[PDB]
Amino acid sequence: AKLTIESTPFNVAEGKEVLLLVHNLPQHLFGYSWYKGERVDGNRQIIGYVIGTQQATPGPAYSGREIIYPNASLLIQNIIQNDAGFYTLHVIKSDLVNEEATGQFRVYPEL
Amino acid sequence: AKLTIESTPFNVAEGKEVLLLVHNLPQHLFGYSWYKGERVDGNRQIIGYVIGTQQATPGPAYSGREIIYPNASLLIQNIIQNDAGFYTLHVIKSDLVNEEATGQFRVYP
Numbered sequence: 001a002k003l004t005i006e007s008t009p010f011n012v013a014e015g016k017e018v019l020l021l022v023h024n025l026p027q028h029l030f031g032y033s034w035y036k037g038e039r040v041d042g043n044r045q046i047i048g049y050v051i052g053t054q055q056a057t058p059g060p061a062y063s064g065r066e067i068i069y070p071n072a073s074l075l076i077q078n079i080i081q082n083d084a085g086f087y088t089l090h091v092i093k094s095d096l097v098n099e100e101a102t103g104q105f106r107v108y109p110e111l
Numbered sequence: 112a113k114l115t116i117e118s119t120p121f122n123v124a125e126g127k128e129v130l131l132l133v134h135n136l137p138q139h140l141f142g143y144s145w146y147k148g149e150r151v152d153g154n155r156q157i158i159g160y161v162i163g164t165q166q167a168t169p170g171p172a173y174s175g176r177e178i179i180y181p182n183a184s185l186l187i188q189n190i191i192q193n194d195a196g197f198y199t200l201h202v203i204k205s206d207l208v209n210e211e212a213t214g215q216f217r218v219y220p
């Protein structure tokens with residue numbers, strides 16, 4: 001019942017893509033804020049996304065390789081080792097009962 | 112300059128009040144939340160305000176003593192020793208690229 005992130009695949013080949021799937025999204029949504037690391041921290045913000053206007057805006061940690069989906073799921077393309085680690089989603093609601101979840105993935109080289 | 116919190120006064124007498132001033136707010140804002148502590152943590156949200164709405168909303172840490180001004184400043188009445196410590200403002204921009212700043216105050220008997 002709780003907001004959760006699941007990476008697919010959990011172990012990712014360099015040069016390939018990972019999808020951070022988002023489950024149990026709440027109602028009353030204004031939009032989404034994604035971060036590298038285990039907490040909400042503006043210095044590590046990848047991207048912000050407003051549902052009503054469909055506008056995505058890069059944060060300080062934006063790489064240009066990300067795609068955000070309407071249900072908050074986040075894809076990262078052309079993966080490098082440095083991408084490995086934790087990713088945190090903050091869901092901003094009109095009632096400010098904002099929800100947070102964290103997921104992770106690992107990276108491996110190929111050939 | 113950078114978003115900064117200024118406690119007024121920094122050293123607060125038990126039973127008196129404190130006002131946390133907010134300097135250098137960015138333009139184009141959705142709203143704000145105040146937290147007890149040094150991070151954004153939903154369990155420690157005191158109060159929040161969505162710009163343009165008729166009311167402020169209490170979080171789990173609300174104690175009936177706090178008001179948040181439209182410019183994000185936090186006023187707390189009837190201070191007790193347990194109020195001492197860090198307070199973190201989460202500024203929610205209209206583009207959802209958000210920012211935080213942390214301030215602090217001390218309480219004396």
Ligand SMILES: [Cl-]
Binds near residue numbers: 036
């Ligand atoms: Cl990490």
Ligand SMILES: [Cl-]
Binds near residue numbers: 149195196
């Ligand atoms: Cl504290």
